[PDB]
């Protein structure tokens, strides 16, 4: 339980810096593909 | 019993006259070792530190080196 | 029990998670080792069931190894077997009594009240009496009638009790008993057995040689031989015991029985085979595989209805045979069996006895405990031996005064 | 040969469990983490955790 | 714990749950009779010993117990009834004689067949 | 099968097993809530 998530969290650093993101595409924030130009 | 005998025999003569792997050329369909053949490779659980000590005299007691 | 934190567990991400848990290193350990059990079983059970697929079996006997003499069936046979050791029926009471005086010392059937009349003589410290009972008072003498004589044998008991435990002492002591303690039901079977080899306590007194090691002489010389000679056929007894009940549970299935015993006083070895009944063969003996071994009822009352019907498609009309087959049939064709019948000829031995307990009608009652037997030497002719031997001894006893 | 060296039941076991020990639990941990963002950090990361989840 | 002792329980437990839900199933679709109901208190009533009916009596009129009284009360019956049928075992009933027995425990009387009809 | 499944060697290692895995059930629970 507890001391389960305690430990996993020790030694969080050393499990792997993959970062999934996450992607949007309906916020205005987002670009085309064809948005980028001379290119 | 002599001929049901001598049948083995002219086998074993025949497979004797065989002698090695001179005349035999390579073959990709039949590698050497069975783990290349047969996709074989260690994964990460079950893996210790201080098994490949292990692993040495493991090697060690079938190089024949009576040090071990 | 911290065991995977020396050196060389690093590396693996479960077994660091297991430096941080105590009881997860516990379970996996427990878990290992059930593991290793399971797989023995898994193991111990295919190899005590696939050696029954390749077991083949005589198909001459049937796997019984063994076929009939005729000559028998209807200074005799001499192809057929040497008789057994219990066909002398004339021996059967004896060799009951030794064996179950032999048994008798083994016995813990009556092990609680032993012990406490052991425990009740051992010390005689205790009485811790009670309240005596409302004491009754025999009929006296000179009144004869069998209710009276019942009364005064069952107030005579204390002064016999201590006479006998004076002629022969508690059981416990005279070892002639199992030990006191040496085994009880609700210990270990590996202490029981501890407890029991630890000095001779596998055999009876009898055959002890501790009570013989001690005098062997020029006279005889059997003193120590003679009771060697008698543990030896004991231990073939027992192990004769042990492989007769190991036939009975094969064949409690239908498995081939594991012991070929050597034919009998009415059975041939069969030649087809060597009197090996079955054996191993590499080959899968498809029939126990598919399961058709045996021969579906109907198709073997049809066999032994057409073998028990012979035909005669010829007739005596043409052929001048008017006989029935066999030899001698001129000499085949030359009291009370219709009503009482025949005489049984196998038990004239106790004949005798019988008119015995004819003659004596007070033999019958419920007072008298006979051992058994039927020879002169044994059971009833022993009492009657005794009673008039004694009446007259006594009588003429009375002659001298 | 190659039946008889698969991984046996403990590997198994090492392997479905560390499974659900590392790569379910542990993502949701660092989700928290760096949402909500040395023994004494990670209490109340196991704290302000418990209190929202 | 004492596998040995667990599965006759286990069973025991099994059958006997089994015969009070087939009760359930039937009082439901056929529902109980009304008064043949005392048919079935009247006939298990009627094999009671005679040694019991001492405190059916004292069943019935207020002085039973309070729960315990009777919980010793019936147990001194139930051992006469023990000691009782001991001794018809071993020296008989009360009208019947050693002969008797000798006659009853070797089966040599037929049950009679022309009284029957 | 089941007079060889159900012997009584048999017997005693299952009981003793399963005293054991409820023992440890029982003894992580406590050391779980004890946290
Ligand atoms: C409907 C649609 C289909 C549904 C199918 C359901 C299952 C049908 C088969 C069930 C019976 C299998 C079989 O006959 O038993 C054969 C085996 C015996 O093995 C065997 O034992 C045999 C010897 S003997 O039978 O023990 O004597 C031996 O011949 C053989 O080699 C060996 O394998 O029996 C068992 O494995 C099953 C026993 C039943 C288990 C009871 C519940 C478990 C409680 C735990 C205690
Ligand atoms: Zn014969
Ligand atoms: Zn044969």
């Given at each position: ?39 | ?68 | ?84 050791a219990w066909?002398?029926?004339?021996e059967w009471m004896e060799r009951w009594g030794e064996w179950e005086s032999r048994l008798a010392y083994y016995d813990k059937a009556t092990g609680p009240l032993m ?53 022969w002492?508690?059981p416990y002591?005279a070892d002639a008993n199992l030990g006191?303690?040496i085994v009880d039901p ?6 029981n057995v501890?407890?029991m080899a630890?000095?001779y306590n596998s055999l009876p007194p009898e055959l002890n040689?501790?009570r ?15 009771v060697?000679?008698a543990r030896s056929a004991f231990d073939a007894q027992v192990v004769m015991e042990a492989?007769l009940l ?123 405990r006979?051992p058994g037997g039927?020879?002169?030497?044994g ?23 | ?53 | ?117 | ?35």
């Amino acid at each position: 339980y507890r001391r389960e998530m305690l430990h996993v969290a020790s030694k969080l650093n050393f499990r792997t810096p993959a970062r999934e993101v996450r992607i949007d595409t309906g916020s205005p924030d987002f670009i085309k593909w064809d948005d980028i130009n001379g290119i | 019993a002599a001929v049901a005998a001598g049948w083995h025999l002219a086998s074993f003569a025949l497979n004797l006259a065989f002698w090695g792997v001179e005349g035999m050329p390579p073959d990709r369909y039949w590698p050497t070792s069975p783990r290349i053949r047969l996709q074989i490779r260690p994964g990460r659980y079950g893996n210790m530190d201080g098994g490949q000590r292990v692993y040495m005299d493991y090697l060690a007691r079938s190089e024949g080196v009576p040090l071990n | 029990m911290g065991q995977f934190y020396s050196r060389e567990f690093d590396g693996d991400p479960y077994v660091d998670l297991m430096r941080s848990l105590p009881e997860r290193e516990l379970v996996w350990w427990a878990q290992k080792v059930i593991w290793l059990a399971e797989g023995f079983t898994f193991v111990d059970h295919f190899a005590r069931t696939y050696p029954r697929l390749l077991q083949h079996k005589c198909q001459r006997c049937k796997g019984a190894g063994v076929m009939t003499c005729p000559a028998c069936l209807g200074g005799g046979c001499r192809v057929c077997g040497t008789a057994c050791a219990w066909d002398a029926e004339s021996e059967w009471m004896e060799r009951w009594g030794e064996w179950e005086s032999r048994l008798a010392y083994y016995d813990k059937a009556t092990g609680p009240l032993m012990d406490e009349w052991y425990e009740d003589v051992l010390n005689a410290g205790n009485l811790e009496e009670d309240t005596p009972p409302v004491e009754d008072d025999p009929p006296g003498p000179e009144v004869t009638g069998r209710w009276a004589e019942h009364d005064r044998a069952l107030h005579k008991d204390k002064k016999r009790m201590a006479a006998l435990m004076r002629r022969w002492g508690h059981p416990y002591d005279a070892d002639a008993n199992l030990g006191y303690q040496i085994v009880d039901p609700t210990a270990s079977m590996g202490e029981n057995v501890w407890n029991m080899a630890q000095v001779y306590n596998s055999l009876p007194p009898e055959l002890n040689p501790l009570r013989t090691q001690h005098l062997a002489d020029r006279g005889g010389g059997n003193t120590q031989a003679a009771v060697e000679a008698a543990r030896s056929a004991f231990d073939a007894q027992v192990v004769m015991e042990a492989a007769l009940l190991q036939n009975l549970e094969a064949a409690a299935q239908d498995l081939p029985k594991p012991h070929r015993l050597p034919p009998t006083a009415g059975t041939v070895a069969c030649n087809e085979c060597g009197g090996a009944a079955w054996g191993y063969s590499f080959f899968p003996n498809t029939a126990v595989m598919f399961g058709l071994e045996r021969p579906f009822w109907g198709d073997t009352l049809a066999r032994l209805s057409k073998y028990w019907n012979p035909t005669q498609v010829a007739d005596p009309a043409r052929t001048g045979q008017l006989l029935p087959y066999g030899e001698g049939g001129l000499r085949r064709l030359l009291a009370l069996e219709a009503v009482v019948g025949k005489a049984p000829a196998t038990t004239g031995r106790y004949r005798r006895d019988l008119e015995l307990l004819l003659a004596h009608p007070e033999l019958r009652d419920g007072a008298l405990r006979v051992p058994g037997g039927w020879g002169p030497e044994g059971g009833l002719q022993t009492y009657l031996r005794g009673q008039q031997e004694e009446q007259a001894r006594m009588q003429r006893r009375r002659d001298l005064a | 040969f190659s039946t008889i060296t698969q991984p046996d039941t403990d590997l198994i076991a090492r392997q479905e469990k560390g499974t659900l020990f590392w790569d379910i639990w542990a993502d949701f941990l660092v989700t928290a983490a760096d949402y909500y963002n040395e023994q004494n950090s990670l209490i109340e990361n196991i704290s302000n955790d418990f209190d929202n989840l | 714990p004492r596998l040995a002792a667990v599965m006759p329980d286990a069973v025991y437990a099994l059958v006997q749950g089994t015969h009070k839900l087939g009760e359930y199933a039937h009082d439901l679709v056929f529902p109980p009779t009304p008064e043949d109901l005392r048919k079935l208190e009247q006939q298990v009533n009627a094999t009671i010993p005679r040694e019991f009916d001492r405190v059916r009596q004292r069943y019935a009129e207020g002085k039973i117990a309070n729960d315990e009284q009777l919980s010793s009360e019936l147990e001194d019956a139930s051992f006469n009834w023990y000691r009782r049928q001991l001794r018809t075992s071993v020296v008989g009933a009360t009208d019947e004689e050693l002969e008797d027995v000798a006659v009853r425990k070797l089966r040599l009387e037929p049950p009679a067949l022309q009284a029957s009809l | 099968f089941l007079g060889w499944l159900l012997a009584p060697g048999r017997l005693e290692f299952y009981e003793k097993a399963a005293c054991v895995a409820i023992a440890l059930r029982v003894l992580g629970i406590v050391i779980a809530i004890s946290t």
